[PDB]
């Protein structure tokens, strides 16, 4: 009976699919409820700014203003500061930023503030990713090991002193609490504070950055080291180390959250069974 | 001896670290060599466009222009981007961790929800993508059961045909999940042949720079186009998930072969030098 389990597998996958379909629909409406208003409030107030310089300079062709703005937004994607009060310009592909870029490729964070424009840069980025992503995986896995065996020494000491008048499978709950607590301190809270001061971000923007980065979603709306401001350069190599170990942390956390879903799915799969079997007495 | 194994583990991690460090250094110089010139060529030709626009339109003064550009930079920070469909797109970019970033939350509440929506959505999507990987894998197992029957009754036998099977996987795999979609993006999006394959890899490896996004431009899209792209991603991600893992195991083998090749080079230099 090889096809027997396969019929049972397709049933499980199809239900998860429809859950994901419905989870996206929920998220979709939640986001547009949150972001549609600010969008329209800013599109109406950008047309207010539009006609303030549409008719304050009629001697501009007025179809070429909207083509001008295309030419600025097209060139802003490579990163430009097209100003006369600042015509000397730092490079986005210097010795360090191309090193940053390679990191965003193999980690699959891919902020996208810096992206290749040359046809050769694209072809190499394709080759660099298909080899670098697996290569980086072994590093991140070994970092997960070393970081995990450090925590194993930490709970060996703590699961010794909390042995008062003790069960085996319930202290596992205490160990997962100290993991998430210490974890969010070293890899979420403490770094976000540093980004708040050094980058100038808000308290929310920093934690937003930490999560979007270490989950490798990497929108790129916020990037550490993205400005010119000062950058001690004590700063940036520490952020590399943060990513290396912070990615290893969310790797476990996200896997823990996955197992929680497994349990919640089991509890709710049987709750529907109990709901049926009772059906109002 | 518990710390004896741990020293063997840290030495394994440290060497891989130094490989990744040096792999980044190689890549860094290679991209800088590739992209530093385009940067200068476009920085010089954007200043040409700037001082061209003051002369070809004396109407505008040098002082008005700096004001306009701040107002465009202000609007780049926002741009419908959040209509019924694009917010659905957005949630997809979150759970898949592709995160193109062409659309990103600006409201403080949208950020807080995106944090919560990801921490629960990313594991949830993993199970879907894992199940898609299973079903897709058992389909191809039916395919090799057929093909490992017709080739294996004749010319050269086992332990080398497993190499032939993985070639068929990668060959037809790149057909269904890289080549055939990239052709569709070339026509429908208007991209180049390179840009489409560039998109396919950046997207399905979940790097997702966001420089190229299918459905991101303002073009008429057939009602079947975007939902097929979802299905593509769902199954295309499952494809590179295996492909990247195959490439990982290749490196494992290559690491073993090169780790002993160094041992051979040393062992010859050893008793070639004992020859006095
Ligand atoms: C596209 C960017 C090019 C990146 C090229 C990086 C290759 C670096 C040179 C390979 C040797 C690394 C240093 C020596 C390590 C050995 O002492 C050690 C065993 O003792 N090997 C390993 O740890 C295991 C290491 C084995 C990993 C091999 C990586 C495969 C890269 C394939 C790229 C082919 C292009 C060839 C261009 C030269
Ligand atoms: C806007 S810029 O690109 O032109 N300037 C720079 C931008 C960023 C960095 C940098 O190292 N940030 C830390 C870091 C490291 C690795 C990874 Cl993967 C992600 C991150 Cl955030 C350096 C220069
Ligand atoms: C300015 S815009 O908001 O309108 N740009 C858009 C870009 C793409 C889409 C869309 O549906 N793409 C298919 C798709 C599905 C899931 C995933 Cl994860 C990725 C992708 Cl590309 C919608 C809008
Ligand atoms: C698991 C990661 C959850 C992150 C929660 C961090 C909470 C920070 C609150 C700051 C006030
Ligand atoms: C040990 C982890 C400490 C991480 C600090 C990163 C700060 C940026
Ligand atoms: C500019 C400084 C950024 C480059 C620092 C390189 C550090 C390598 C990773 C260390 C961990
Ligand atoms: C098999 C179907 C499993 C359905 C359980 C989904 C669990 C989602 C829990 C989200 C709570 C918020
Ligand atoms: C942040 C949004 C959370 C959305 C949670 C959706 C919960 C969906 C529950 C579906 C229950 C299906 C029961 C099937 C059991 C056979
Ligand atoms: C089941 C649907 C649950 C919806 C929860 C939405 C919470 C939004 C919080 C934003 C702050
Ligand atoms: C899973 C639930 C995690 C919720 C964490 C949200 C913390 C955001 C605090 C922002 C202030
Ligand atoms: C068009 C050329 C694409 C090159 C793909 C690189 C194959 C490795
Ligand atoms: C096959 C997968 C179907 C996915 C349904 C989502 C359709 C969204 C259309 C975009 C508008
Ligand atoms: C058309 C340009 C393609 C460039 C990709 C070739 C890269 C060669 C590898 C360099 C090894 C150091
Ligand atoms: C049939 C393969 C799906 C992508 C077009
Ligand atoms: K990204
Ligand atoms: K990713
Ligand atoms: K991005
Ligand atoms: K990403």
Task: Give the secondary structure arrangement, pairings included.
2 copies of one chain form a homodimer.
Chain A: H1 2-54, H2 64-76, H3 97-106, H4 119-161, H5 168-199, H6 203-214, H7 235-278
The complex binds N-((E,2S,3R)-1,3-dihydroxyoctadec-4-EN-2-yl)palmitamide, ligand Q6F (2 copies), hexadecane (9 copies), dodecane, pentane (LNK) and potassium ion (K) (4 copies).
One potassium ion sits between chains A (108-110, 216-218) and B (97-99, 206-208).
Descriptors:
homodimer; 281 residues; mainly alpha; 7 helices; 0% strand; binds N-((E,2S,3R)-1,3-dihydroxyoctadec-4-EN-2-yl)palmitamide; binds the ligand CS(=O)(=O)Nc1ccc(C(=O)NCc2ccc(Cl)cc2Cl)cc1; binds hexadecane; binds dodecane; metal transport; ion channel; K2P; trek1; trek-1
Give a concise summary.
Chain A: It comes from Mus musculus. Chain A has helices spanning 2-54, 64-76, 97-106, 119-161, 168-199, 203-214, 235-278.
What does this structure look like?
The structure is a homodimer. Chain A is mainly α and 281 residues long. The first copy, chain A, has one domain. Helices cover 74% and strands 0% of the residues of chain A. Chain A contains 7 helices and no strands. In chain A, helix 5 crosses helix 6 and helix 5 packs across helix 7. The longest helix of chain A is centred in the N-terminal third of the chain and has 53 residues. Chains A and B meet through helix 1, helix 2, helix 3, helix 4 and helix 6 of A and helix 1, helix 2, helix 3, helix 4 and helix 6 of B. The site of one copy of the ligand CS(=O)(=O)Nc1ccc(C(=O)NCc2ccc(Cl)cc2Cl)cc1 has 18 residues of chain B, from helix 3 and helix 7.
């Amino acid at each position: 009976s090889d096809s027997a389990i396969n019929v049972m597998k397709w049933k499980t996958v199809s239900t998860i699919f429809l859950v994901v379909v419905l989870y996206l629909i929920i998220g979709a409406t939640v986001f547009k409820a949150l972001e549609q208003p600010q969008e329209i409030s800013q599109r109406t107030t950008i047309v207010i700014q539009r006609e303030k310089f549409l008719r304050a300079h009629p001697c501009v062709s007025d179809q070429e203003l909207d083509e001008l703005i295309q030419q600025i937004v097209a060139a802003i994607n490579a990163g430009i500061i097209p100003l006369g009060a600042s015509s000397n310009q730092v490079s986005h592909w210097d010795l360090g930023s191309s090193f940053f870029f390679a990191g965003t490729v193999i980690t699959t964070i891919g902020f996208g503030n810096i992206s290749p424009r040359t046809e050769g840069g694209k072809i190499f980025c394709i080759i660099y990713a298909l080899l670098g992503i697996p290569l980086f995986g072994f590093l991140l896995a070994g970092v997960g090991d070393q970081l995990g065996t450090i925590f194993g020494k930490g709970i060996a000491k703590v699961e010794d002193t909390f042995i008062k008048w003790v069960s085996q499978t319930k202290i596992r709950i205490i160990s997962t609490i100290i993991f998430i607590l210490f974890g969010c301190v070293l890899f979420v809270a403490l770094p976000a504070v540093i980004f708040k001061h050094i980058e100038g971000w808000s308290a929310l923007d920093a934690i937003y950055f930490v999560v979007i980065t270490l989950t490798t979603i990497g929108f790129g709306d916020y990037v550490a080291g993205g400005s010119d401001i000062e950058y001690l350069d004590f700063y940036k190599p520490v952020v590399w180390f943060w990513i290396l170990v912070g990615l290893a942390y969310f790797a476990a956390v996200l896997s823990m959250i996955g197992d929680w879903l497994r349990v919640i799915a089991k509890k709710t799969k049987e709750a529907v069974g109990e709901f049926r079997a009772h059906a109002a007495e």
